Design an enzyme around this catalytic site. Structure first.
Site, mmCIF file in Angstrom:
data_model
loop_
_atom_site.group_PDB
_atom_site.id
_atom_site.type_symbol
_atom_site.label_atom_id
_atom_site.label_comp_id
_atom_site.label_asym_id
_atom_site.label_seq_id
_atom_site.Cartn_x
_atom_site.Cartn_y
_atom_site.Cartn_z
ATOM 1 N N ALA B 149 12.599 2.898 2.083
ATOM 2 C CA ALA B 149 11.517 3.272 2.978
ATOM 3 C C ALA B 149 10.451 4.075 2.239
ATOM 4 C CB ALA B 149 12.038 4.098 4.160
ATOM 5 N N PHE B 151 7.111 7.041 2.204
ATOM 6 C CA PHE B 151 7.001 8.451 2.563
ATOM 7 C C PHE B 151 6.255 8.672 3.873
ATOM 8 C CE2 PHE B 151 3.220 7.430 0.157
ATOM 9 C CZ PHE B 151 2.214 8.082 0.840
ATOM 10 N N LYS B 175 18.033 3.867 1.148
ATOM 11 C CA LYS B 175 17.392 4.678 0.118
ATOM 12 C C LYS B 175 16.080 5.224 0.666
ATOM 13 C CE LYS B 175 14.619 5.343 -3.669
ATOM 14 N NZ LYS B 175 13.133 5.326 -3.757
ATOM 15 N N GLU B 178 11.905 9.745 -1.753
ATOM 16 C CA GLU B 178 12.271 11.023 -2.350
ATOM 17 C C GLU B 178 11.441 12.178 -1.803
ATOM 18 O OE1 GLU B 178 10.906 8.519 -3.723
ATOM 19 O OE2 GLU B 178 8.991 9.143 -4.598
ATOM 20 N N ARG B 179 10.280 11.898 -1.211
ATOM 21 C CA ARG B 179 9.402 12.961 -0.739
ATOM 22 C C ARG B 179 9.751 13.442 0.663
ATOM 23 N NH1 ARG B 179 7.454 15.642 -0.484
ATOM 24 N NH2 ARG B 179 5.193 15.947 -0.271
ATOM 25 N N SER B 228 3.945 0.037 -1.002
ATOM 26 C CA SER B 228 2.780 -0.461 -1.715
ATOM 27 C C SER B 228 2.985 -1.912 -2.146
ATOM 28 C CB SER B 228 2.487 0.418 -2.931
ATOM 29 O OG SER B 228 3.588 0.437 -3.823
ATOM 30 N N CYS B 283 -0.018 2.097 7.109
ATOM 31 C CA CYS B 283 -0.276 0.711 6.734
ATOM 32 C C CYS B 283 -1.085 -0.028 7.791
ATOM 33 C CB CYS B 283 1.046 -0.019 6.487
ATOM 34 S SG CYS B 283 2.151 -0.065 7.918
ATOM 35 N N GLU B 383 -6.552 -0.233 -1.629
ATOM 36 C CA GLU B 383 -6.013 0.399 -0.430
ATOM 37 C C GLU B 383 -6.179 1.909 -0.557
ATOM 38 O OE1 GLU B 383 -1.891 -0.345 0.200
ATOM 39 O OE2 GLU B 383 -1.868 0.490 2.231
#
Lengths: 499, 499, 499, 499
Positions: B149, B151, B175, B178-179, B228, B283, B383
């Site tokens: 996933a 952030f 998973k 990390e942020r 991304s 998005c 983007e």
């Protein structure tokens, strides 16, 4: 003494290829050159893709009802010209006339299922998700599609691939096998005669060059393939690399499980018909048999039943299995049988040295039954794709299920038994997407989908059925909101929508 | 002054990683280190995959009813802890409390849709296809699934990915970004509290190492990704290379078409909310606006409306948009705005030099509006993923549709108008899988499917909905023959089945 | 001491009835009056219908999401108060605590299935049926609905009737059995606590006046009934006469076919549990058993197994079956057994003269097994609806199938056998909409539908499932056409639409 | 010249009736006797039902694939013989050749939709609801079905009724209108020539005796009717009284709402075509028009457009509307116009005294437009069913919606407008099952079901579509359980199944 040339199909016109390299078409019953299929040149494939793209907009804007009527008339024409396609298949591929008729009939059933586009292309709606807000989705075509069919099914695989895609609104660029193009050409002619606008269907022939063209060109959105594992994986990778959805059905090693309480004579007849039918050149052939418990005693009867088969040309009356596609396939089958023998396996019936009266030059291989085979043998790991049946012996059904699960190829399997608990246990514990209870060839009918497995299939969606419809189509979800205050213009709305 | 460490969730136990590599968690409003997330070691990821595999058989054998009860209790627990997860998201990701609560509520809606497993996992049947023959299909789980996933949605996208696979009977190796791992940790704790068997859901954290592990390990059958374009394409390729089905929702560029007859104030409010909501880090944010015909006159009013937005920390009352995720994102947005300015663009509102009272160290960027943008400009092709709105002007709706079609990103688009014919024309001619009529954020509810497009998605099946259920499941077609003569044993059958 | 009075549920308020006619509530284990239920007066029923009508518009305009949340909270409250409802059911109806818990659990499963209203209420669409023409449909509520439930299930059948109808947007006028209203009152209280708007659910009580009011009032659109044949037919006729759609599940007579190859002990246990479970007062109880071939030898073992049952009050530990509903039912069962005996039938086990320690006043009837019964006997034609099992003997399975088809009641049937072919033959030839293979109680789970038959059901659509949703909803097809020329006003269209 | 006698279709043979009562067939353009249809005697109807019953078992046991092929060949024959049926319809019913061709084309579309039986009859399955337990359902035919069609659709409604029941596996007893039996005879001949077994379809003729026989015979399971309110209600009551499911479509008073912003010329053309098309003898014709707001100014233009219609015999070139069915219908229409005039209405166009060159004896009635009509007027409450248009005027859309809701007949409605908000408001607030946005005749295509409403339809399930298949079929839910311990007989099971 001029060999006929296989005509291309570009822009709705049968045109002869201007290429220099030609592939000779041999009759498997006599290995005589009956035709030549050319390798489509770069310019010809470019023109074919351009015609597909030009036909895409008009064919897609056309109402689904018109496509339904077109496919109905196409099915009618197939019904009218079924015997001609069957004879052409028996001539090119070599399968028995009955086998070609069954192929054409299954293709016709697939087409008839595709004629249900009216109910298959229906979307979904959800009114009043929020005050003055609606939500609905539409099923739309993808674009230019491509297909690559094998040699063992000249008519079934094209009728799986291109009718579904075209009726959903797409334009298909069908690449038939270089060994049996006549069936695809006849199908394209019948489709053109059914009202299909020019440029909607296009056909190109050629070797890996054409496959690379199809997998590399960006204008192709979907690719359908059925064949060997190597080519299937290569095509899937080369397609996913460029961003194209690819569904590829690959080799299979279907396993047959015979329980002690199963119907002896019927089970043996089914095993014989499925292992040696169509010379075993089928992705669903029951080339492996697992005798559980007391089923070991049926090996002599199985061999006796296999000895009753008639090996002759496809067009001869009373023929059961035809010759192989090419001498290379015969040599491969013979080498695999020799390797199996060298690895400790025992051959109960040997048909490698069979000779047919009047067809000494044909690629004929008689029924072959191998026993005492283990999972670690080459004949078991490699896809024979011929008239060879490997038999394994187990003491309990648990061992048979374990052997079936350990084998990577799981395209399909069948268990023979008269006990419901045994069949349910097998169907629940076996890791195979196509399980057969007293059915040796569990080919799902058109309304269902061909449910591949771990190794015998790559991709996400299946070939035909609702899966097929979803594969060649994309969903367009539309979130619509029409505030009631806008129906009668009185003042602008200065409030953002809030749940 | 000890920074808390994000513990791994392996085998149903929150355990601290033994890895030597750690990644600091910074609060975007002050850039103060609030936690550290470790990169899972090879042994830890192996143990997680082993736990997932060990839990797969028991979890799949569990009746669908028990999984439905588990999902219902998990939804209940989410409802009981909505504001806690909202505050945690506001702390980690930085989005305002309103946006965090909306994220949690949309994830709860996704879970509630997943609770319909009973009506979504139902197969199909066909009785009496042949005398004493039946046909039916079963939906079954795939195996160990994985999810990666981004952030910008610490809770919505994880609840898209793992609950769907869980309720269908699959074990999930999630998973999270990390942020923002805290939201995923809280969700996993609430799930373990709902009665989920230990080892069914496992979570690991790490940089490209963990992504490579997930994409390379063979025991993983399906992978879900949102983020991304570069990472999405990389993951999709690395997965399809190893035979794994992958669905990757990639970057997007949404266009908002404003017609002259649209509701002025409401349309402007919607455009502002969708372009600057959640700091534009979505998005589905309408980072592009197309003013058709006389809509050019609304630029001053749009700028005035954008000037009324409040830029402040996510936890402060009245905060409309929070800071960016990291200083790197702010630098990227500023450099993109600079490049757009160099290429001839005109900035009507500049928020780069904005300063917030008490949060001078935060990654804040005020509402930015760019005009006179062309399709060939950097700010348009790249983007932005931030609080920036590029505006284009066209004389006719045909030009707007052409611009939208030429644009590669087609995740979603919205057209504002009070004329039904215009909306229908746009929705039919626009090549976007998600069209919105007077709806700025046409995010389909969980009951529908997130219909990706050409560039904003790679794969075949969508994330949630019927497609979402189909993605994490496989069909098992069973063909069974039960000849009547076998019910009363009198004599063996010596005739092979014939349709 | 004073006897509590059952309160009416009108306008969301538990109000005391002003009726002068009262019906006493007797505890079937001791015949002690534990409560009184009044007959709703004309004014009270009129007020209830007015409240339903007033709540209909707001409840229907409420988005499906809010109704789903309300029903989820209602399911949660049921889970929280399951044991209390079970105790109340055991007190009023008398069934064992385990039986009441199973009733409440099946009702909870029905509610949890109803939670899928989001996916069940989906419509259909067909875009581009003609140039610039679209077609779609919507599912909308009907209006004020009513429900008449029997006594044998104070909770299961009400939760079949009112939740399904309410979640779709309708307002329900429930009518529980005058002998067990407390469970319905508790369920209504829990529903009101779940956040349901006041007036959406109204409940009245009565024997015949309330039924006539429900069937005659024009504001009621749908009526759901479960019970006997006389009342079911009367209600169905009186409803269809007024143009109301009515579904009435009527009496039943289930036949249990025991093949010689079936599991002896398991089959006997299942037969006993289904024939004497819940005092045989279930509409799906296997009151009839057909012993095919060598199954005749199992009568002594069946009698021995039936002798092991414990007949005691529903709240006592180890109670297998509770007392009957009223002394009238006991007298009816005794008279039916006497008639069967007078018609030549043989009784193997007689429980009419059973006496329970401490509950001599209870309406207890011990397990009864009748043998040598013929289709022309009264006990076979009449629905016993008690702990009585009639056994028939057939020479072949064909005779058993013929007997089953000749019986007018076909609510459900079960065949016990270990041979798949026999079960398939039975399920194919038996004219019963609910067949069971080794399952004594083939009650379809909520996701399926309770498929009525010739005599055990009157109507077209079933109770729950997809059919259940369709019954309480109506389709609204919208054929919308938005010509492209209207998107940009240039000149009026002077051509009528043509295909 | 002798008058030809219509033949009865019993047992697959066209035979003349031995009845002494005959009904003359008059050509509506000249009122000349062109044929006679007999009232089937009791013995003939009994023999027809006996043939239906005898054909039911074999036809139902036949695989769905064969019935699909039969329907495909029947659709082919209809396509081949479309013009003959069109001419027969123009001769008997009197509608224009174009109207008859459209009738036959819509019937052909319904047949083609019925050809999707392979996808519509598919059931559902839920595997592993309990350990070693499965659950699935099957769609099966009901039995002998009956149909009663009106005169205004000699081919469309028969093809609604009998093909659906035929392909589902049911035998049909079709009772066509006594005024137009030739179309039904030709359709039955084409069906018999398409491979339909003899006796599967039977036809009888009569006015009231046949209806009473159909509604009173216990062997008939379903009845389909379309026509007036009196006959529909009578048939529905007489059917539900005997326990037969009945779906009866009845009269209609469809309303057309014209908004000021609608396309003037196109809206007027659509109104004219739908109000005077087929001489207004349709259940979906817009016999009522509501001019909202400034739409009042379009009355002169509407009258001018209506004056351009050509009233001539159906077979004459350039004809727009044909004559009425019988002189009684003309007298009824004239008396209704007179009554409307007496009640204060204003006739803008009067066609009662129209005279056609060469057809002075025909039942021709010219376009009639009535204005200033109120809801309480006779011409408004009574179904004109002719070339008459009553126009109402309202100041706001709310008034038009209220008028439409107050009207009992709601078979369909249409609103003309170029604003999406107005269309959505109308479609959401109007209490009509068939709404049309700029579509005057919102007849759902065969893929969608006919969604008549409160007064225009009686019954539960709709006529065609998925509802059609559900009506002529019944679900057989099978709860199967095969314990794993039974797969390998080792010891009997002494434990009853427990969740």
């Amino acid at each position: 003494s001029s060999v006929p040339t296989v005509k291309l199909f570009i822009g709705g016109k049968f045109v002869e290829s201007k290429s220099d390299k030609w592939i000779d078409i041999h009759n498997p019953a006599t290995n005589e050159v009956i035709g030549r299929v050319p390798q489509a040149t770069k310019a010809e494939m470019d023109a074919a893709i351009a015609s597909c793209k030009r036909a895409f907009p008009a064919w897609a804007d056309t109402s689904v009802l018109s496509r339904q009527q077109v496919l109905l008339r196409y099915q009618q024409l197939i019904k009218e010209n079924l015997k001609e396609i069957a004879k052409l298949i028996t001539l090119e591929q070599g399968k028995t006339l009955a086998d070609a008729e069954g192929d054409v009939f299954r293709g016709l059933q697939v087409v008839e299922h595709a004629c249900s586009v009216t109910s298959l292309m229906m979307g979904e709606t959800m009114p009043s998700i929020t005050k003055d807000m609606d939500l609905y989705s539409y099923r739309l075509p993808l674009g230019v599609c491509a297909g690559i069919a094998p040699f063992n099914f000249p008519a079934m695989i094209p009728l799986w691939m291109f009718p579904m895609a075209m009726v959903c609104g797409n334009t298909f660029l069908m690449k038939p096998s270089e060994r049996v193009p006549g069936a695809t050409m006849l199908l394209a002619k019948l489709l053109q005669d059914s009202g299909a606008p020019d440029g909607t269907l296009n056909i190109i022939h050629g070797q890996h060059e054409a496959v690379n063209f199809i997998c590399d060109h960006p204008d192709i959105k979907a690719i359908s393939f059925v064949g060997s594992n190597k080519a299937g994986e290569y095509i899937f990778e080369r397609g996913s690399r460029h961003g194209k959805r690819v569904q590829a059905n690959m080799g299979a090693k279907n396993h047959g499980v015979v329980m002690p309480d199963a119907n002896k004579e019927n089970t043996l007849n089914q095993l014989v018909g499925a292992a040696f039918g169509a010379a075993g050149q089928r992705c669903m052939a029951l080339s492996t048999a697992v005798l559980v418990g007391e089923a070991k005693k049926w090996l002599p009867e199985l061999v006796e039943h296999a000895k009753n088969l008639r090996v002759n040309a496809g067009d001869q009356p009373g023929a059961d299995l035809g010759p192989l596609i090419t001498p290379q396939a015969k040599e491969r089958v013979c080498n695999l049988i020799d390797s199996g023998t060298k690895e400790g396996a025992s051959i109960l019936l040997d048909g490698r040295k069979i000779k047919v009266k009047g067809y000494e030059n044909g690629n004929f291989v008689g029924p072959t039954i191998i026993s005492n085979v283990k999972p670690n043998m080459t004949c078991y790991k490699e896809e024979i794709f011929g008239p060879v049946l490997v038999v394994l012996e187990t003491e309990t059904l648990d061992e048979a299920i374990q052997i079936v699960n350990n084998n990577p190829y799981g395209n399909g399997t069948a268990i023979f038994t008269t006990n419901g608990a045994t069949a349910r246990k097998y169907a629940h514990l076996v890791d195979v997407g196509q399980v057969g209870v007293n059915v040796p060839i569990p080919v799902p009918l058109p309304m269902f989908s061909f449910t591949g497995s771990r190794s015998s299939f790559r991709g996400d969606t299946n070939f035909y059925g609702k899966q097929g419809i979803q594969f060649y189509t994309q969903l367009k979800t539309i979130t619509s909101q029409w505030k009631e205050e806008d129906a009668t213009l009185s003042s602008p709305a200065v409030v953002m929508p809030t749940m």
